[PDB]
């Protein structure tokens, strides 16, 4: 399963 | 060892709407899933036959997570324009690679979680899975925000947890193709050149996985500076090709040996024309 982004750059 | 990796790209196109967002997933050297925002009814999709066994929840859930990721990258692209004081008129590319390398006892060996902006390293999670390396000024802003937010701990949970468990499970369910080995079929071709000498080209064809070592020797000494090689290339049917060549004097071809090492060979091959 793939990764999820939780924080913005 | 085996790996599960996701390759993510967002490219802005001012004047032609929202940026293009793409994800591609791989197990070792095999692509098995993809998402493309430009497609119609954009959906996480099978690109290997062993993955199409998963029920609609797998696809629903991965389409949700891709679409959420897409929104994050839209915001990240405009944040980059403020960090670097760039006009909103130009196109820019943000890339992300995350995944895990696992030994074959189910034990993690390295996690990856790294980004690049317009083709250069931006920030990467270090191999302790706890600290970041920031390429420049702007990335150091991101570093300090991610340090305060505890980002590494959450991203490390994915690499240590579901990336290892889902890899292990993809390997079982796609065993027939993923844990196959195809040895190279190798041979040497001989070509006369217009100024008197000879090209010998050592071919390795139809092999899997992609890693391979191809070298030429003259009387037992390796020709490390003289060899020409091509980048390993897909045949398009799941296997790969590579060749290595040397230029040798006419009448001395039988003094040269090509050596092939590959996971599919019990012993390296030595070939001679």
């Amino acid at each position: 399963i793939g990764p999820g982004r939780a924080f913005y750059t | 060892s085996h790996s599960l990796r996701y390759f993510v790209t967002a490219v802005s196109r001012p004047g032609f709407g929202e940026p293009r967002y793409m994800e591609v997933g791989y197990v070792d050297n095999t692509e098995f899933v993809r998402f493309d925002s430009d497609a119609e009814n954009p959906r996480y999709e099978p690109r290997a036959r062993w993955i199409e066994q998963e029920g609609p929840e797998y696809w629903e859930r991965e389409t949700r997570r891709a679409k959420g990721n897409e929104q994050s990258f839209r915001v990240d692209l405009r944040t980059a324009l403020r960090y670097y004081n760039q006009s909103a008129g130009g196109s820019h590319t943000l890339q992300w690679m995350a995944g895990c390398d696992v030994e074959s006892d189910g034990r993690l060996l390295r996690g990856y979680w790294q980004f690049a902006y317009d083709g250069c390293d931006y920030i990467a999670l270090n191999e302790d899975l706890k600290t970041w390396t920031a390429a420049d000024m702007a990335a150091q802003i991101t570093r300090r925000k991610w340090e305060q937010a505890g980002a590494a701990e959450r991203d490390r949970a994915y690499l240590e947890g579901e990336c290892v468990e889902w890899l292990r499970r993809y390997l079982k369910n796609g065993n027939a193709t993923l844990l196959r080995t195809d040895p190279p079929k190798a041979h040497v071709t001989h070509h006369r050149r217009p100024e008197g000498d000879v090209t010998l080209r050592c071919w390795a064809l139809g092999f899997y996985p992609a890693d391979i070592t191809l070298t030429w020797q003259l009387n037992g000494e390796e020709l490390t500076q003289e060899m020409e090689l091509v980048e390993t290339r897909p045949a398009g049917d799941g296997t790969f090709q590579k060749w290595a060549s040397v230029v040798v004097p006419l009448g001395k071809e039988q003094k040269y040996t090509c050596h092939v090492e590959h996971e599919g060979l019990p012993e390296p091959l030595t070939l001679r024309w």
């Binding site: - | 790209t9 591609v24 590319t93 890339q95 250069c120 897909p234």
Partner: protein, 99 residues
């Protein structure tokens, strides 16, 4: 940073004339991802060409594979032409059956 594509043009099986085969045009090492790839037979565009999904490498450069069915002959010439913002001209690479 911008990098110009590298191109390999090659058959999927050992070429023999009169026998059906697959011709590949493998384009690597380019950045940004915007690219146009055409495969040509005697200077004319081949209509059905299949494109893989594009991905990228360890160094972040992109790569993609285009391919089409073909039956090589003694007289037809094949090439792949690539247009990328890193070059002023499109780059054409002709198929050499020994490469």
């Amino acid at each position: 940073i911008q990098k110009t594509p590298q191109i390999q043009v090659y058959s999927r099986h050992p070429p023999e004339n009169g026998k059906p085969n697959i011709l590949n045009c493998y384009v690597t090492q380019f950045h940004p991802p915007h690219i146009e790839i055409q495969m040509l037979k005697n200077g004319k565009k081949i209509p059905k060409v299949e494109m893989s999904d594009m991905s990228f490498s360890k160094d972040w450069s992109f790569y993609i594979l285009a391919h089409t069915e073909f039956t090589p002959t003694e007289t037809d010439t094949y090439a792949c032409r690539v247009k990328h913002a890193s070059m002023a001209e499109p780059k054409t690479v002709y198929w050499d059956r020994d490469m």
